[PDB]
Structure 1
């Protein structure tokens, strides 16, 4: 399984290490701008913490 290539669990979309487009969460996770709003809206436990 291609786990070496990251994905956005916030909405099952694509994601990459480049944080110029992807906003950095203060816990070190990346998500596209809109998804930063979506996630921060909930303030829920960051699922990305399971994958690194």
Structure 2
């Protein structure tokens, strides 16, 4: 499950093939297609992944698996 509190976790939604606006159909981390009802997380660069897959990835790497943009928080009171 999530290792962050809900209000600190990346935003997420459940995949629905009937109303899916994104160009992505594939979780590249596990190389498996998105399926209806699966929980996806979306990074600040707008790339999306299965929640379980990207959580692991970001703990180890901090960067988006696809574009390598750092998904870390931009904090008000630190650099």
Q: Tell me how large the CA RMSD over aligned residues is.
A: 2.5
Which residue is 2:43 aligned to?
25
Q: What stretches of structure 2 of length at least 5 have no aligned partner? A: 1-22, 68-79
Which residue is 2:12 aligned to?
none
Give 1:43 deviation, angstroms.
2.0
The two structures have a TM-score, normalised by structure 1, of 0.53
**SS at 1:48's partner residue?**
coil
Q: What stretches of structure 1 of length at least 5 have no aligned partner? A: none
What are the residue-to-residue correspondences of 1:5-20 with 2, within 5 Å?
A: 6-15=25-34
Point out the structure with the larger helix share.
1
The two structures have a TM-score, normalised by structure 2, of 0.40
Aligned residues: 42
- Say if 2:57 and 2:65, in contact at 8 Å, map to a contact too: no
